[PDB]
């Protein structure tokens, strides 16, 4: 059910490519790309939460993303996933996006901010769906054959595949300090702030409102946000709180792998001619098609080849 | 197909971290010295080395 994200918030994470070729800390970042399904469907895990907005109410039209120490909402219609051409997103829930993507070498997930700015994260990822059957086809045909395969279903129920969410670490921020003539002033904007200084009064402390510390420089003080009222996924892209894990939350991973049938095409009838102990087959493949043959005696003498163009073979 | 589970790394600054051996299927743990990680808001913590 959608009621799992009640006390969870999205998180900013390091991204190797933010669109301009430079790594940066993005609201959206790719954690894991799962392609266990054999029909090509991709389950992409991102730091965003889709389908649940702020104020903790389910809404399929909105997603929520961390902006600056606090989440904010955006419209889902701006979400895009691409490898080399835009992908068709078949589903979304929380941190997980179910999409279908063309063959490619990278994977970029992005959206539009509330301030009408674009955010995107790009990860190197070799996407190439495995061949189902003996024909390398590009889209399911009108007329053909059915073969077993595995896909990601649309179901968002609990799947006993579980992901841990625990209390996020202290969030450092250099913006919290303003220098005025040797006085470091710490703003709060509504969040508890830890500070530690080696100037003036070297005594570190904790605030909930603005403070000023005299005879100090912005260089020699540290600030962070500590009172975190929501817990986030223990992603490998955020530091841990202590030697042990906080645990304290759990989220089911939706779209379980399920066990279906895929449609594959059947090649055209080849033109067959006969000769003395010889069969001359002229073949018209629309797409790379496997041709194999064997003897039915004691020696199979199996032979195979991928026919890609109109070809005459004598067997 | 296997999946690699990686809990969040432990950044212990102004100190030295350590971990204990576990009995997980293929468990690997290590401590790296002299790291100075940054977050989106800046450096994670003061002590520079």
């Amino acid at each position, epitope marked *: 059910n959608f009621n799992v994200y009640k006390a969870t918030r999205p998180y900013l994470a390091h991204c190797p490519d933010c669109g301009e070729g430079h790594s940066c800390h993005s609201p959206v970042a790719l954690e894991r790309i799962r392609n266990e399904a054999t029909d090509g469907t991709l389950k992409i895990q991102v730091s965003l939460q889709i389908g649940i907005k702020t104020d903790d109410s389910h809404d399929w039209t909105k997603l929520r993303y961390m902006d600056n120490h606090m989440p904010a909402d955006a419209e889902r219609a701006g979400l895009f996933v691409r490898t080399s051409a835009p992908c068709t997103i078949t589903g979304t829930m929380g941190h997980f996006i179910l999409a279908r993507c063309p063959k490619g070498e990278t994977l970029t997930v992005g959206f539009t901010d509330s301030r009408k700015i674009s955010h995107s994260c790009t990860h190197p990822f070799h996407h190439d769906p495995p061949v189902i059957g003996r024909e390398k086809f590009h889209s399911r045909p009108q007329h053909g054959k059915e073969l077993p395969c595995s896909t990601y279903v649309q179901s968002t129920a609990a799947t006993t595949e579980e992901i841990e969410v625990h209390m996020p670490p202290d969030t450092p921020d250099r913006t919290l300090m303003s220098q005025q003539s040797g006085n470091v002033k710490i703003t709060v904007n509504g969040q508890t702030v830890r500070y530690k200084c080696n100037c003036g009064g070297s005594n570190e402390g*904790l605030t909930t*409102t603005d403070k000023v510390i005299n005879n100090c420089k912005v260089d020699q003080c540290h600030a962070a946000v500590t009172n975190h009222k929501k817990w986030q996924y223990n992603s490998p892209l955020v530091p841990r709180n202590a030697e042990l894990g906080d645990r304290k939350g759990k989220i089911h991973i939706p779209f379980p792998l399920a066990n279906v049938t895929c449609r594959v095409p059947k090649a055209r009838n080849p033109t067959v001619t006969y000769g003395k102990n010889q069969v001359i087959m002229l073949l018209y493949p629309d797409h790379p098609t496997l041709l194999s043959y064997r003897n039915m005696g004691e020696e199979p003498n199996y032979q195979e080849e991928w026919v890609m163009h109109k070809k005459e073979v004598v067997l | 197909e296997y999946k690699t589970v990686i809990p969040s790394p432990y950044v212990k600054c102004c100190g030295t971290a350590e971990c204990k051996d576990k009995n997980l299927p293929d468990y690997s743990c290590k401590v790296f010295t002299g790291v100075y990680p940054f977050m989106w808001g800046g450096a994670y913590c003061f002590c520079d080395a």
Partner: antibody, heavy 121, light 109 residues
């Protein structure tokens, strides 16, 4: 959930070292994100704060008493201890050990059974 | 430092009636105020944190409100078990962590 139990001499002399050890039950030091600390209240007065210990390695002390107040933790036998040196008669008060299990702030919501500390006579 | 003053120093009011207590701050602490209960022979007990909501096991009879430098604690009805000495604590700027001097709650006679 978790419980606190204080232990100490109770009666001290002038210039003597006061040591109070609070042992934790139903839990351990290596636990979720929260604080430890010690509180004291003179009879007929409000509560006064001595110090607090955060598991991250930092310690916080009351500036008026920070010069003598030392807070340590023994994770092996699983307690935290407060030491006040050169205790004077003005420090006679009921002491408690405390912690704030939830939300990791400066408040307190768990307690032991505090003991009276008298210094003179 | 920041100092809290409670009002009244002593309050006497009959069981089963609505009660009100005031805590005033020397400096604005937003909502960083906690309302605390203590009984003779008992350790202090937390009732309200951040001047809102309530800790686990604390019923709805206590209601905290206020902001800035002025905060109020409202008791919908005093049952016979609710008579104790109450305190207000600020955490807006600590160390040191500051508590109120205490208000005495009595039953009117």
């Amino acid at each position: 959930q978790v419980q606190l139990q204080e232990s100490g001499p109770g009666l001290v002399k002038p210039s003597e070292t006061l040591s109070l050890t609070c042992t934790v039950s139903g839990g351990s030091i290596g636990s979720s994100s929260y604080y430890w600390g010690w509180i004291r209240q003179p009879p007929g007065k409000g509560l006064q704060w001595i110090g607090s210990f955060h598991y991250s390695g930092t310690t916080y002390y009351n500036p008026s008493l920070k010069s003598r107040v030392t807070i340590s933790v023994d994770t092996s036998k699983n307690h935290f201890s407060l030491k006040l040196s050169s205790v004077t008669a003005a420090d006679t008060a009921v002491y408690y050990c405390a912690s704030r299990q939830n939300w990791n702030d400066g408040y307190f919501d768990y307690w032991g059974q505090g003991t009276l500390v008298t210094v003179s006579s | 430092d920041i100092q809290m003053t409670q009002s009244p120093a002593t309050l006497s009011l009959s069981p089963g009636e609505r009660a009100t207590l005031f805590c005033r701050a020397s400096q604005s602490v937003s909502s960083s105020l906690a309302w605390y209960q203590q009984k003779p022979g008992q350790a202090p007990r937390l009732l309200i944190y951040d001047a809102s909501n309530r800790a686990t096991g604390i019923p709805a009879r206590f209601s905290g409100s206020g902001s800035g430098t002025d905060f109020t604690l409202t008791i919908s009805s005093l049952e016979p078990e609710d008579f104790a000495v109450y305190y207000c604590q600020q955490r807006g700027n600590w160390p040191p962590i500051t508590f109120g001097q205490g208000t005495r709650l009595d039953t009117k006679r």
